[PDB]
Structure 1
Amino acid sequence: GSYKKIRSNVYVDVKPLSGYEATTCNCKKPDDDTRKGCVDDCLNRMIFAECSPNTCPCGEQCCNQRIQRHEWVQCLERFRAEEKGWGIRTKEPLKAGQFIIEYLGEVVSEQEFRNRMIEQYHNHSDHYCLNLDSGMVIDSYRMGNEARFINHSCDPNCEMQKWSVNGVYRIGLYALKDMPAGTELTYDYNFHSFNVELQQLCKCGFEKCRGIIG
């Protein structure tokens, strides 16, 4: 699979404004340099907002700015996944709830995407897209990052979380459970993949596999 690598979303014909900014939290700055801020009941984190750095009381210690500062894990690797094409796995262990990577691509309207589905994406045997917000999709058929190669599983070890970052909705991949070196990342497409009849057979090999994707 060939594609165009990007470092941040390309906004084609829509603007996915969250319609709320993040607004100053009551977290305390730890005195220890190497101790992280905004972990617990960050007001922002509470509602899935990243802190704005012009106002976080924790400055460079805030850990609620992961998407903003592109704090992706460095240990990912692409590989051939039996009966699934290509996939992604981690090289070192990951921890429950740890931020992994942003899902990137072209941010398009409901209709634009339907149009792409007709005039280009018809003949495809792999699909690369995620729902964003209210008839807007992230289309990574052409552009994205390594997140486009993460396979579906009816029993996922990762999840897509919609975040509000500086007034804009974006999607980060987060671990659901602990994972050791060599584990393939998977998430559940059903909850997130746009529904315009992209029925495909599932091969996750989960004992209770739903059998289809969508």
Structure 2
Amino acid sequence: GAMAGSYKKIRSNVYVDVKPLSGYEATTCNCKKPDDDTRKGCVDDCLNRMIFAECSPNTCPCGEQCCNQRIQRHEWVQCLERFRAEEKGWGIRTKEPLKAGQFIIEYLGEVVSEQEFRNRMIEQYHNHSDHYCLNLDSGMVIDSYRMGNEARFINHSCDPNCEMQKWSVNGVYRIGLYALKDMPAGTELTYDYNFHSFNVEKAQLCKCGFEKCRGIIG
């Protein structure tokens, strides 16, 4: 019955220490442009998509027809609701059905180096009953304890319907939430923290309720 955790809402990532630069030359896929405004360009066949790179809109042969610029264009689903999830504080659920592979929302926050987060863990996060952090890349981490978006309220499940994917978006790695399977309306979005989130030494009881639930968060 406790109120939701305060944070400052952001529209894009905040780079505190480092930049999550990827070593990429995005963008010379061998995609063919289709003809109808409603036959999308670059499908999974796309060579940028294959290596989780988004096309650039300046160089993509499909132009304004390419459907592989979801993160940079912020093509988030507009049907999320934060809600009281039993035994798991607050969570996020979709209000409309989603489909496997569908991009849902970007995970936002303060991008910090591994060590900066560790310091933060001792000076400020030692009395916390909730943990808001994803691994990004090479010792870098997206911290949403303070600044973030509604993706910070997404809970863990040992049998998840969603996953975090790391994409290079015009040279920078960003993390988005994507559907793993079809999900109907009202469904609580979940991903596996073990794989995606940063480990804390402090264990919490898992309540995901899967038959092979690990019993532990982390």
Give the structure-1-normalised TM-score. Answer: 0.98
On the 8 A contact 1:88/1:184 being kept in 2, the answer is yes
Paired with 1:24 and 1:40, the residues of 2 have a C-alpha distance of 15
Paired with 1:193 and 1:205, the residues of 2 have a C-alpha distance of 20
Q: 1:14 aligns with which of 18, 33, 42?
A: 18
Q: Give the superposition deviation at 1:48.
A: 0.7
Paired with 1:151 and 1:111, the residues of 2 have a C-alpha distance of 25
Deviations 1:16-58 (A, max 9, x none): 1111121211111111012211113111001110001110000
**Hey, which bits of structure 1, 4+ residues long, moved more than 6 A?**
none
Report the equivalent of 2:158: 154
Q: Give the superposition deviation at 1:87.
A: 0.4
| CA RMSD, Structure 1 to Structure 2 (Å) | 0.8
Please give the secondary structure, in 2, of the residue aligned with 1:108: strand
Q: Give the superposition deviation at 1:72.
A: 0.3
Report the equivalent of 1:120: 124
Q: 1:43 aligns with which of 42, 47, 53?
A: 47
Number of residue equivalences: 214
Q: Higher mean Cα deviation, 88-97 or 192-201?
A: 192-201
Q: Give the superposition deviation at 1:2.
A: 0.9
On the 8 A contact 1:87/1:184 being kept in 2, the answer is yes
Deviations 1:102-153 (A, max 9, x none): 0000000001000000110000000000000011100000011110000000
Deviations 1:57-84 (A, max 9, x none): 0011111100010100000000000100
Q: Higher mean Cα deviation, 199-208 or 118-127?
A: 199-208
On the 8 A contact 1:21/1:164 being kept in 2, the answer is no
Report the equivalent of 1:139: 143
Q: Give the superposition deviation at 1:9.
A: 0.2
Deviations 1:85-106 (A, max 9, x none): 0000000000001000000000
Show structure 1 runs of 5+ residues with no match.
Answer: none
On the 8 A contact 1:151/1:187 being kept in 2, the answer is yes
Give the structure-2-normalised TM-score. Answer: 0.96
Q: Percent identity?
A: 99
Please give the secondary structure, in 2, of the residue aligned with 1:132: strand
Q: Give the superposition deviation at 1:192.
A: 1.3
On the 8 A contact 1:100/1:175 being kept in 2, the answer is yes
The 3 A distance-change label for structure 1 pair 93 and 57 is same
Q: Higher mean Cα deviation, 20-29 or 9-18?
A: 20-29
